[PDB]
Design a binder for these strands. Sequence first.
RNA 1: GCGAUGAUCACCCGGGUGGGUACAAAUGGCAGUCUGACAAGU
Lengths: 51, 121, 112, 139, 232, 45, 205
Amino acid sequence: SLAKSPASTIQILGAEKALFRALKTKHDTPKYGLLYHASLVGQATGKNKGK
Amino acid sequence: NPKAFPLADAALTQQILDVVQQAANLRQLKKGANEATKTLNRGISEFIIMAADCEPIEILLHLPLLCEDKNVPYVFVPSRVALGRACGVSRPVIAASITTNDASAIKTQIYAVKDKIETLL
Amino acid sequence: KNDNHIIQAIALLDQLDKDINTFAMRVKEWYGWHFPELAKLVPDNYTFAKLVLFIKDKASLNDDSLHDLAALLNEDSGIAQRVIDNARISMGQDISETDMENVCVFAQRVAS
Amino acid sequence: TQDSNYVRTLRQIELKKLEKGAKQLMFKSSGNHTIFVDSREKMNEFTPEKFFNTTSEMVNRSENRLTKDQLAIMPKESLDKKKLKKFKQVKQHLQRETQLKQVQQRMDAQRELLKKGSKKKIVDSSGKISFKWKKQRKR
Amino acid sequence: KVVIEPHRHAGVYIARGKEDLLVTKNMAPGESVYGEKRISVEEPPTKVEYRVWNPFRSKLAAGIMGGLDELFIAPGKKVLYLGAASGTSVSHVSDVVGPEGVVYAVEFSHRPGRELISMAKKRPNIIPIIEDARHPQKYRMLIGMVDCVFADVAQPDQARIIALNSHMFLKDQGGVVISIKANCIDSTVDAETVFAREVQKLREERIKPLEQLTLEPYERDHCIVVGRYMRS
Amino acid sequence: EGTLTDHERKYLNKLIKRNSQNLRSWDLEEEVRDELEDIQQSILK
Amino acid sequence: MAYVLTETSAGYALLKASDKKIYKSSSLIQDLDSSDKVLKEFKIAAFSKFNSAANALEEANSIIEGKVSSQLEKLLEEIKKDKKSTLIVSETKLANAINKLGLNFNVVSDAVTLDIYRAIKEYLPELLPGMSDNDLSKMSLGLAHSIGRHKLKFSADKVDVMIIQAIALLDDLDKELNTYAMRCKEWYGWHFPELAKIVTDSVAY
RNA sequence: GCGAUGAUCACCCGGGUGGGUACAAAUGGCAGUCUGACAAGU
């Protein structure tokens, strides 16, 4: 099931509550989801975490 | 490349790659495996083109599973470099999707190729 | 004059009664994959854990082993014969040795 | 972009509601039903009631036909009205889905004009307006 | 409350009420195979779980709504299901046959096969056979004689697959139910012409055709042909 | 045994009317089927 | 003499046929319609049972591949004493393999023999005393899945359902370990309340 | 052979509906998984 998901979903997989609130209320959406705790994201800083 | 199936012949690839170019100029083309995966989920995909020389082939092998689930035609073309140039970008493309539009100026050509891909499956 | 020891004990005692059940239920699931029917044979969870500690692999079935598991609890329910006959013909998919190691250790945990 | 996201999310909800609703409903079959008889005589004296061994009213019910031997507190009109609402409710879900689909497509068409490239507006005799992009590779 | 009622074919019901649906009794209560709705109703009273049968997902269910005269799938009968993609339809067929009956599900593709196996564990009466149906001799051990043969295989040479399986495992005067897709066989001609050929090819194989039924609106260019296996 | 009397095929056949009469209520009324049929085509199409 | 090799989920069965050339009779269907006729015509010459599922799976794959197994060989070796006997096989592949063994058997696989197997399989439970139809299904069920696990290349080390349980269990242990630690801190802290501020780690505490 | 160390103080036909507290399960609902070609340097 995960393999059949696009890479965008895997980015924001764990943050549905923030995502769908933002999508319905015309606000900016989250950018980390559950991947925020990966080591590589931790090494990044500032806006580079989103990239 | 046994996994790539059905693989279009040279005559059919030219027809597929011709529609991909026309769709690109009309902004009726979605490029990339991730962006092609979405169109299947939204049910807006006429058919999916994939590149057989993608390495490792598995990165695009989820689309046949989604396509047979949604009953969307799909076909493989031998070269991903050629697919990218047809799409109209500077990078190789391993997958692309033709978006559904019943008011499109190239509707007849898409359906003509779509029928041929169905026969191939 | 201290009575707070009583309050600690009761707060801990019911917590143990919850954890013993919660962990015991998990032990039934994990070994259910390897031998699903046995969870039906021995409903009492504590007996199930001790039995699973013995019958780690349902392939291993000996007459002496039947006696040893027959010693576990009593043969009045007949479960000793059912497990031997049923282990021979069952649908449980064999799990890896490392997986079995977790089940017995986790079953050992419920015992402690 | 946020407008496009908002409409698509609404359309996705409607589609899923449509799929759940259709599974709820039951559609009577409309398909031809041929029977094979070896003798030409068995054709001529063929009768649906005799072959199915059931009353003539009972024959025309394809979903559940019963032979005579098997045959051997809500008002009906209100129950009739409750079916039709369930059918009309699913239809309205489909109509809302198509409208949301059209709104999004026009939104996406405008977003493409915002992006970089060289485009020419082409107008048909009917008056439909579309844009044709030049054949320039994206660098 | 919903009024469950009997249906012509044993093992099948209709859950009449505000919503009416084709329904089968659940063999393994407390779970759904492919996310189908379940309805439980008390009967003297004990609540018995039921599963909904979606005609659009199963072609056999489309046969029921069409009003097939005779189905050889009935409680306490052995059924050979060819083309068992997953438990979407085999589970319902398993429900109809009941605990006494048995279902022999044959599949070739591995990825649907693993899905089929995971269901077969919940249903003791389903025997999943991951093998190519074109060579029935490969799985002759696992199958005894069967009362009926159901085939949903979408192959151009399907009538031959029915021949080999019917000859080895089907009983005399047994059942044959075939689901036919015209587009696979020949898309140049209309579906009626394709169906006429398929009936004739079965006739060459000592199968007497009894009835034919087209599956609209559930499917387009599909029909179910029922025949009896006359060895004599 | 097919030994029905002239009384026999009346009682059983009354049951046929009785049950068939019952199933008509579930079958639903025809004028509704006129509207329900149209809605069915739109949803299916 | 005429012999019939019958393959079953329970084991191998050698049926001795009374008539040497039963497979050229055009009336087989009528002759074998009833169990009594089957039993009279066919008598068990030797029966090799699968002792364990692992053996059965190995035996099953040999038949599917068309290879003669050791158990089948030994079972044929018992009946070798009959000079000039015909052996009937369902598959042409298995018949050919048995021929290469060099055995004193005229191995025959014909479409006519197909009817013989049809009757045998139909009345097999009655043909084979001691095992009921319910049991025959039960061995078939277990054997089928094990074959299915083999063909699907199932490996105990590649099941993801264990991952989903382990992560859920791991979170549960973190919660429970936390409550017990707090209970010890507050229960033991009565005796010596200054420890908790000094040492914060539960395990060190 | 008493007591301030405490007297006294929902519905329907043996059967079924109505209400409350606690826990557990649900592939039951809310519920729908972001965008898509430029960016950084000399």
